[PDB]
A paper describes a structure:
In the Firmicute B. subtilis, the ytqI gene product was shown to be a major nanoRNA turnover enzyme, and was renamed NanoRNase A (NrnA). We show here that Bacillus NrnA is a bidirectional nuclease that can degrade RNA fragments from either the 3′ or the 5′ end. We have determined crystal structures of B. subtilis NrnA in its apo form, as well as complexed with substrates. These structures reveal a dynamic bi-lobed molecule with the DHH catalytic domain and the DHHA1 substrate binding domains connected through an extended linker.
Bacillus NrnA was crystallized in the P21 space group with four molecules per asymmetric unit. The B. subtilis NrnA structure comprises two globular domains connected by a linker region (residues 178–194) that consists of a short α-helix bordered by two loops. The N-terminal DHH catalytic domain adopts a mixed α/β fold featuring a 5-stranded parallel β-sheet at its core. Residues from the DHH motifs come together to form a surface-exposed active site that faces the C-terminal substrate-binding domain. The C-terminal DHHA1 domain of NrnA also adopts an α/β fold with a central mixed β-sheet and helices on both the apical and basal sides. The four NrnA molecules in the P21 asymmetric unit of our crystal structures display variation in the orientation of the C-terminal DHHA1 domain with respect to the DHH domain, and the distances between Cα of H284 (at the end of the GGGH motif) and Cα of H104 (in the DHH active site) can vary from 11.9 to 19.3 Å. NrnA from B. fragilis, M. smegmatis and M. tuberculosis are reported to be dimeric, and Bacillis NrnA in our crystals packs in a similar manner. The dimer interface in Bacillus NrnA covers about 1600 Å2, 11% of the total surface area of the molecule, and is centered around helices α5 and α9. Whether dimerization is a consequence of crystal packing or is the physiologically active entity is unclear. In either case, the NrnA active site directly faces the DHHA1 domain of the same monomer and away from the dimerization interface, indicating the catalytic cycle of an individual nanoRNA occurs within one monomer.
Author numbering: -3 to -1, 1 to 275, 278 to 311
Write the structure that this text describes.
């Protein structure tokens, strides 16, 4: 809604202090929406006290640095939470202690928190929504500088896997075209987003070398303790590699089994068949899913089922 968009801008003009949140374990969209908006507000309102809080992610610290804020700073503040569907995942829970709370998200509105809410499930990403907000804010004095343009672009390219994912729409590409006119270097941004440690690259090599495809295009990857120790890779590094099998000729759906301290992180992926239906105490989207498990026996039966989902 255009009105709804205007009501956010009006509210932002009104508060002297604005403190911005995002979700725990932030991804590029969280940096681009939260920090992109911070940077628009800093440029536009050099008289306001603007702060972006939370715990940084070291692989994205190159985008922007966060602030360490006192409890007193929230008194009478506007608080803005970006890209966070559930209150319990907001990084830095002090979010409701301001005078006002504003929710800007693209995930379904199951937790309809905020005094003002702007939820658009058709946006690719919350970074796209921030660029659309800025388009409506321009007429009200908003300024997008080079740093902000770079943040928003980074959000959009990280969240869509660089216009690869089904969440890419016409607006995504249009706004990216607009944003790429700012004098930041897109190629050094991509170099940094995609920079990968040699040991993780090696683990990725081990996975490619040993993957096998059934008759039905099903595939599986067991990354056990020993494997992690040998490559010096964390379980989280290993699981983040699940998406690298997607270009294999004839692959339909696959799964990673990563052995953690407490559980075994399971990651599912599919080139077509729906895999949320595969129940095992965890679900997700139709082509990307997750769950936990507690023995290899249980993994072995997930396998039998994957075979079936792929045969059918």
């Amino acid at each position: 809604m255009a009105s709804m968009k205007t009501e956010l801008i009006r509210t932002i003009s009104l508060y002297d202090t604005i403190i911005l949140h995002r979700h725990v374990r932030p991804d590029p969209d969280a940096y681009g929406s939260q920090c992109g908006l911070t940077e628009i507000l800093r440029e536009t309102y050099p008289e306001k006290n603007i702060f972006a809080v939370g715990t940084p992610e070291p692989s994205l610290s190159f985008l922007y640095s966060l602030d360490e804020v006192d409890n007193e700073t929230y008194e009478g503040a506007l608080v803005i939470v970006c890209d966070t569907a559930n209150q319990e995942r907001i990084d830095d829970q002090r979010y409701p202690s301001g005078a006002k709370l504003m929710k800007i998200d693209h995930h379904p509105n199951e937790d309809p928190y905020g005094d003002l809410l702007w939820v658009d499930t058709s946006a690719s990403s919350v970074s796209e929504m921030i660029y659309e907000l800025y388009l409506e804010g321009k007429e009200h004095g908003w300024k997008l500088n080079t740093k902000a343009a770079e943040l928003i672009y980074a959000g959009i390219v990280g969240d869509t896997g660089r216009f690869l994912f089904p969440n890419t729409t016409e607006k995504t590409l249009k706004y990216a075209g607009e944003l790429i006119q700012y004098p930041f270097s897109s190629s050094e941004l991509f170099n940094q987003l995609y920079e990968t440690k040699l040991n993780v690259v090696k683990l990725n090599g081990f996975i490619f070398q040993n993957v096998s495809l059934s008759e039905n295009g099903a595939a599986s990857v067991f990354i056990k303790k020993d494997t992690l120790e040998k490559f010096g890779t964390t379980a989280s590094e290993a699981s983040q590699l699940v998406g690298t099998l997607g270009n294999i000729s004839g692959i339909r759906a696959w799964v990673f089994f990563v052995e953690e301290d407490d559980q075994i992180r399971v990651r599912f992926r599919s080139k077509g068949p729906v895999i949320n239906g595969l129940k095992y105490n965890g679900g997700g989207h139709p082509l990307a899913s997750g769950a936990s498990i507690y023995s290899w026996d249980e993994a072995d039966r997930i396998l039998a089922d994957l075979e079936t989902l792929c045969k059918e």
